[PDB]
Every structure is written in structure tokens, then in C-alpha cells.
């Protein structure tokens, strides 16, 4: 038996719609913001970010736990064999999004996982060098878009990098108020919105087979 391409939480029709709509409003707003227009040189008339992030999920949004490549990825067998994964397979979850973000490479939403959902977060031996210093599960995100040259993999790395700055106290003071939250400028083309109300999205834990 081969494993899926990857396991993860796949958001319902309605919830994918809410998050997608919310990510796309952020993009028109960030692209229209004075603070962003000024720093556009450190990013790349106005730039239309919805177009910039041309490579979008075409259907339902998802939050990846463990990329398996059908069993070719390190720790895939390990992960899939866990009681918690088999038990959770096909179960419903509510995910909490705390922030939307943008970099020159990706646009995503930061997921904050409950301890129960953390039981489903992988515990691999090959761990990212930007992951260290952050709790397990900090990589948890939903990808909203990518630049032409970029793989959706980059979104997770982009998120860790951004939070590696937050833990360093390197976010600074907010440079704007969008209707949903406070806008931060991390430098190096990076931007974070901390949501006033975290949005709850519904999702099913299952496997995706390409
Ligand atoms: N090398 C890798 N490590 C972890 N996840 C990967 C990966 N390569 C691709 N992916 C994930 O597999 C999917 C490919 O269809 C992408 O959505 C991406 O998830 P992501 O959106 O969370 O970044």
C-alpha cells in the first residue's frame, strides 16, 4: 500500500471560501497601503499583489501535516502508521488562523494548532534549520498564493522565517491598521497581519493522492 502524496486538514467549501476571500482582501489592501508602496524596492505604478501571487490553490484550501510522496519522504511510513493518524483519518477539525502574511515569494495564513491537532503534527528526524527555537507546529500554515518561480513548499519556510523574527522581537511597532488587524513590516519584503479575531475554519483530516 502506498501512502498519500501528503496528509493534512482540508477545509470545507464554505471555510475555503472565507479564508480565500479574506486572503485576497489583504492582498488588495496591502498593495494599496502607503507603507507597502514605499518599500516596494525591497519587494521587487502600483503592484497588483493578487496578480503577483498568480499561482493559487484552484479549489479547496488545506493545511499540510506530513508530506509523504507516497512513501518516498523520510519518516512517511513512521507518520502514517501512528494510531493518532489512522484514528483521526476522516475526522473534522476547527483550525485557528492567527495571521495572514506576504513575502516576495508566498502569501499564506498562519495556523495555530490545538494540542489535539499537534498530536497529528509530524516529529521528523530531518528537521528544518529555521524550525529550531520555535515550538513544534509553528510551520503550520495554509498557502494562499506563490510567485511564478516558487514552490508552495516555500510558504512554510517563509512562515518560520517571519516567526524567527517575532521571537527575536524584530517585528517592531505596527505600521498600519487594516480593518481586520494590525499591519507589521518585518523588512526584506515581508509583511504580517495579526488578526484581531482569529478566524476559525472547519477542515477534514485526510490524505491527498495527487
Ligand atoms: N518538500 C516538501 N516538504 C514538505 N511539504 C511539501 C514539500 N513539497 C511539497 N510540499 C507540499 O505538498 C503540496 C504539493 O501539492 C504543496 O501544497 C506543499 O504544501 P504547502 O502548501 O503546505 O506548502
From Swiss-Prot:
<feature type="modified residue" description="Phosphoserine">
    <location>
        <position position="170"/>
    </location>
</feature>
<dbReference type="GO" id="GO:0005615">
    <property type="term" value="C:extracellular space"/>
</dbReference>
<comment type="function">
    <text>Catalyzes the formation of 2'-nucleotide products from 2',3'-cyclic substrates. May participate in RNA metabolism in the myelinating cell, CNP is the third most abundant protein in central nervous system myelin.</text>
</comment>
<keyword id="KW-0472">Membrane</keyword>
<dbReference type="GO" id="GO:0004113">
    <property type="term" value="F:2',3'-cyclic-nucleotide 3'-phosphodiesterase activity"/>
</dbReference>
<dbReference type="GO" id="GO:0008344">
    <property type="term" value="P:adult locomotory behavior"/>
</dbReference>
<dbReference type="GO" id="GO:0043209">
    <property type="term" value="C:myelin sheath"/>
</dbReference>
<dbReference type="GO" id="GO:0003723">
    <property type="term" value="F:RNA binding"/>
</dbReference>
<dbReference type="GO" id="GO:0042470">
    <property type="term" value="C:melanosome"/>
</dbReference>
<comment type="similarity">
    <text>Belongs to the 2H phosphoesterase superfamily. CNPase family.</text>
</comment>
<dbReference type="GO" id="GO:0009214">
    <property type="term" value="P:cyclic nucleotide catabolic process"/>
</dbReference>
<dbReference type="GO" id="GO:0016020">
    <property type="term" value="C:membrane"/>
</dbReference>
<dbReference type="GO" id="GO:0005737">
    <property type="term" value="C:cytoplasm"/>
</dbReference>
<feature type="binding site">
    <location>
        <position position="64"/>
    </location>
    <ligand>
        <name>substrate</name>
    </ligand>
</feature>
<keyword id="KW-0378">Hydrolase</keyword>
<feature type="active site" description="Proton acceptor">
    <location>
        <position position="62"/>
    </location>
</feature>
<comment type="subunit">
    <text>Exists as monomers and homodimers.</text>
</comment>
<dbReference type="GO" id="GO:0048709">
    <property type="term" value="P:oligodendrocyte differentiation"/>
</dbReference>
<dbReference type="GO" id="GO:0009636">
    <property type="term" value="P:response to toxic substance"/>
</dbReference>
<keyword id="KW-0488">Methylation</keyword>
<dbReference type="GO" id="GO:0007409">
    <property type="term" value="P:axonogenesis"/>
</dbReference>
<keyword id="KW-0597">Phosphoprotein</keyword>
<feature type="modified residue" description="Phosphoserine">
    <location>
        <position position="51"/>
    </location>
</feature>
<keyword id="KW-0636">Prenylation</keyword>
<feature type="binding site">
    <location>
        <position position="143"/>
    </location>
    <ligand>
        <name>substrate</name>
    </ligand>
</feature>
<protein>
    <recommendedName>
        <fullName>2',3'-cyclic-nucleotide 3'-phosphodiesterase</fullName>
        <ecNumber>3.1.4.37</ecNumber>
    </recommendedName>
</protein>
<keyword id="KW-0449">Lipoprotein</keyword>
<feature type="active site" description="Proton donor">
    <location>
        <position position="141"/>
    </location>
</feature>
<keyword id="KW-0694">RNA-binding</keyword>
Amino acid at each position: 500500500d502506498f501512502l498519500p502524496l501528503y496528509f493534512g486538514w482540508f477545509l470545507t467549501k464554505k471555510s475555503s471560501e472565507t479564508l480565500r476571500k479574506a486572503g485576497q482582501v489583504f492582498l488588495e489592501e496591502l498593495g494599496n497601503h502607503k507603507a507597502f508602496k514605499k518599500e516596494l524596492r525591497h519587494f521587487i505604478e502600483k503592484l497588483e499583489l493578487v496578480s503577483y501571487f498568480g499561482k493559487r490553490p484552484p479549489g479547496v484550501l488545506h493545511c499540510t501535516t506530513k508530506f509523504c510522496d507516497y512513501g518516498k519522504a523520510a519518516g512517511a511510513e513512521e507518520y502514517a502508521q501512528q494510531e493518532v493518524v489512522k484514528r483521526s483519518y476522516g475526522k473534522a477539525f476547527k483550525l485557528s488562523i492567527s495571521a495572514l502574511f506576504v513575502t516576495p515569494k508566498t502569501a499564506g495564513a498562519q495556523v495555530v494548532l490545538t494540542d489535539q491537532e499537534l498530536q497529528l503534527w509530524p516529529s521528523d528526524l530531518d528537521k528544518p534549520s529555521a524550525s529550531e527555537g520555535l515550538p513544534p507546529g509553528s510551520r503550520a500554515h495554509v498557502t494562499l498564493g506563490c510567485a511564478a518561480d516558487v514552490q508552495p513548499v516555500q510558504t512554510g519556510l517563509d512562515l518560520l522565517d517571519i516567526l524567527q523574527q517575532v521571537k527575536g522581537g524584530s517585528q517592531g511597532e505596527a505600521v498600519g491598521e487594516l480593518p481586520r488587524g494590525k499591519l507589521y513590516s518585518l523588512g526584506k519584503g515581508r509583511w504580517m497581519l495579526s488578526l484581531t479575531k482569529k478566524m476559525e475554519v472547519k477542515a477534514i483530516f485526510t490524505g491527498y493522492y495527487g
